Amino acid sequence: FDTSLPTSHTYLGADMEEFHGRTLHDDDSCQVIPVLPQVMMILIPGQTLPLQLFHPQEVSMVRNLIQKDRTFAVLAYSNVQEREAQFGTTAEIYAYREEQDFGIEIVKVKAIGRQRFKVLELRTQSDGIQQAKVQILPECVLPSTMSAVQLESLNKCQIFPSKPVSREDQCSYKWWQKYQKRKFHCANLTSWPRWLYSLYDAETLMDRIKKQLREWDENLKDDSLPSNPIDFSYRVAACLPIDDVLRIQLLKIGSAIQRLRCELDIMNKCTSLCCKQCQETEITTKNEIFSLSLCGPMAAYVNPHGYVHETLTVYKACNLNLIGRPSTEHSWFPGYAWTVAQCKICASHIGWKFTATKKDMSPQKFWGLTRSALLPTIP
C-alpha cells in the first residue's frame, strides 16, 4: 500500500491533541530536563518515537511536562546498563492523549528528537524520575573547502544549473563531471587533485548516498530526502541496520560532512545480517530490504505493553519458524496481520510475518525484523 500510513501510528490512536513544535536551546547551556525510564535506545534527531506509558509516575511526569516546555531526554545507553550513559537526544512532544480504558491512567505519546547533548551528572529524585544535567552540543557547519583559496576572479562560475529531469542514462555522469571540473577549478593552485576535493564535498556525498539508496525506493530528489545537509545526514543515519556502537559513534560526529563520509563507509562495508544468539542466517542479503514507509527502511513502533520494537522491513527471510494464526489486532501496518516469527535454532523472537488480506497488494512476505536481535554479521 502507500507509504504515508506507517508514519502516523494510527494503531496507537486517532484523536491526538497535536502542538506546533517550537522549542530550541542555544548551543552551550546547562539545562535540567527529565528522563523517562524504561526506554533504552539511541534516538537520532528528527526521528519519531511512539510511547505508551502506563506507570502512574511516568504518566504524572508527562502530564506536568505537557503544561511546561514539552521536552525530555532520551539517553543513549551504552553497552553498560544501570544509568551508564554519556550521550543522548532531546525529544519534543507533539502528540498526546489519555484513555481511561480498564481504569488506570493510560497515556499515549509521540515525540521526535530535536537536539544533541552530553551528560554531566544524573541527579536522581526520590519520586522515581531522575533529572539530567546535560550540555547541548552545537550543530557546527564548516565552510566550503574552496572558499579558503577561491580566486576573486573565479566567483561567478559557481552557480550551477538545476538538475535536469532525474535519474536518466548519461544524465548523471556527464553532468557531474562538468560540475566537478567547473566548481573545483582552483584545485590546481593547491597540491591535491580535483577528485580528492570532490571526496570532501557536500552535495557530492549527498548524491552518492542518494544513488546508493535509490535501490530501496523511488523517492523524488526534489522532496523526501531533505536538501539540508544536517537533516539529510540524520535521516540517512536513522534508516540503516547496524549495531548500537556505530549509532553512538555516528551521534558523536559533529560536522555533517564527517557523518556523511562515515555513513558512506559503513554503507559500503555492510553486507549481511544475522541472529544475535547464533552463527549464521539467510537474511544475509542486505540488498533485499525495502522501505514500505516514508521514514525509511526502519521506524520506531510501540506494542500494546509499551515496548518499542524498532522494525526493519524485508521482503524475504529464512531460518524462522511461524507459529499462530495471522492475527491483526494491533497491526502496525493497517492492511496486514502478524504471525510472530521465531528463530529456528536458539528459539529467540525475531520479527513478524505480515500476511495480507486483499488482492491488489503483496499477498505474503513483508517481514518486519526487530533491531534488538539482528547482528550485522558482515564478514
Binding site: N303, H305, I323, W338, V340, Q342, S348, H349
Partner: peptide, 26 residues
Amino acid sequence: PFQCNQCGASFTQKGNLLRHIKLHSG
C-alpha cells in the same frame, strides 16, 4: 490459553511458559 509478553506467543502448559519467559531473558 496462555499468552506471553513483548513477543505475543502462546503455549499449552504452565511449565512451558516458565521456559519461554526465561528464553526472553537470555
